[PDB]
Motif scaffolding. Structure first.
Motif, PDB file in Angstrom:
ATOM      1  N   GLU E   9       0.953  -1.056   0.018  1.00  0.00           N
ATOM      2  CA  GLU E   9       0.002  -0.059  -0.011  1.00  0.00           C
ATOM      3  C   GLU E   9       0.858   1.275  -0.033  1.00  0.00           C
ATOM      4  N   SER E  10       0.820   1.905  -1.148  1.00  0.00           N
ATOM      5  CA  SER E  10       1.480   3.275  -1.321  1.00  0.00           C
ATOM      6  C   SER E  10       1.036   3.966  -2.435  1.00  0.00           C
ATOM      7  N   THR E  12       3.044   6.311  -4.101  1.00  0.00           N
ATOM      8  CA  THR E  12       4.444   6.873  -4.569  1.00  0.00           C
ATOM      9  C   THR E  12       5.373   5.892  -4.877  1.00  0.00           C
ATOM     10  N   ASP E  13       5.386   4.686  -3.968  1.00  0.00           N
ATOM     11  CA  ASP E  13       6.321   3.563  -3.981  1.00  0.00           C
ATOM     12  C   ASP E  13       6.354   2.820  -5.411  1.00  0.00           C
ATOM     13  N   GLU E  15       6.361  -0.569  -5.267  1.00  0.00           N
ATOM     14  CA  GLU E  15       5.424  -1.116  -4.619  1.00  0.00           C
ATOM     15  C   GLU E  15       3.959  -0.392  -4.510  1.00  0.00           C
ATOM     16  N   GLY E  16       2.974  -0.909  -4.101  1.00  0.00           N
ATOM     17  CA  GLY E  16       1.562  -0.436  -4.165  1.00  0.00           C
ATOM     18  C   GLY E  16       0.997  -0.528  -5.453  1.00  0.00           C
TER      19      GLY E  16
END
Lengths: 52, 51, 52, 48, 52
Positions: E9-10, E12-13, E15-16
């Motif tokens: 959960e991001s 901006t990453d 990831e997510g």
């Protein structure tokens, strides 16, 4: 198309032989292709314009 | 001098069968093996005996 | 049949790592899987996938 | 030179024919992409 | 088969972001082929023989 011919009548000549002939067919295709456009506009222009 | 198979063209039609189009679907092992706990939020705290 | 007394479960979805383990033996009272949300499906038609 | 005319030689024949097809459903399964549904035991070619 | 992944959960990453995956199919064919034999014999041999 096939070709018929005049047979003649002999047991021994090149004529008197009934000739062989073919019939043939070919293939045609409908192939579906896509035509398109996108037309973008501002929401405020749609709201302020005097026509749909 | 003869009609070949290539000379009748698409008067011969190729068939289609879905008899080979199927796969059994396999569930999670751990969802079947262990207890499934219904969570209502991201985190749950479980106290355990420790000494 | 040798594994009497155990409840046996066989992995069939390709998740098994045969280089790591032959079997796990567990007390199943002591493992929980929390299910916060089951598999849910959304149909996307306007969205952007990826960047650049 | 190999020609046999059946009626002229007072012969007959049977023609026997059949039409067959074979398919092997090599396919994906829940285990992965390219899985073959048959295996073979091959003979012992190794002397003791 | 498709691959799923752990997204986290991001905003901006790297990831997510939920990754994309395909599913695919292939074609297998039945194609009929002819197998045949011709076995000639004299009519006199048929007429003389003590069996069909």
């Amino acid at each position: 198309l096939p070709e018929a011919d005049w047979v003649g009548e002999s047991a021994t000549d090149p004529e008197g032989v009934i000739k062989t002939s073919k019939v043939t067919w070919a293939n045609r295709t409908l192939v579906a292709e896509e035509v398109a456009v996108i037309i973008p506009v501002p929401e405020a222009v749609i709201d302020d314009a005097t026509v749909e | 001098a003869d009609i070949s198979r290539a000379e009748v063209a698409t008067l011969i039609e190729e068939g289609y069968s879905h008899s080979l189009l199927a796969a059994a679907k396999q569930g999670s092992t751990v969802l079947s093996a262990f207890q499934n706990v219904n969570m209502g939020t991201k985190t749950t705290h479980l106290p355990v005996l420790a000494t | 049949g040798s594994f009497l007394g155990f409840n046996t479960h066989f992995n069939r979805n390709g998740a098994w790592s045969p280089e790591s383990a032959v079997a796990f033996i567990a007390d199943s009272s002591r493992v929980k899987i929390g299910v916060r949300q089951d598999i849910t499906v959304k149909f996307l038609d306007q969205a952007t996938l990826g960047t650049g | 030179d190999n020609q046999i005319n059946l009626a002229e030689r007072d012969m007959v024949a049977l023609r026997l024919k059949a039409r067959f097809a074979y398919v092997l459903g090599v396919s994906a399964t829940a285990m992965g992409a390219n899985k073959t549904p048959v295996g073979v035991v091959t003979p012992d070619v190794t002397p003791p």
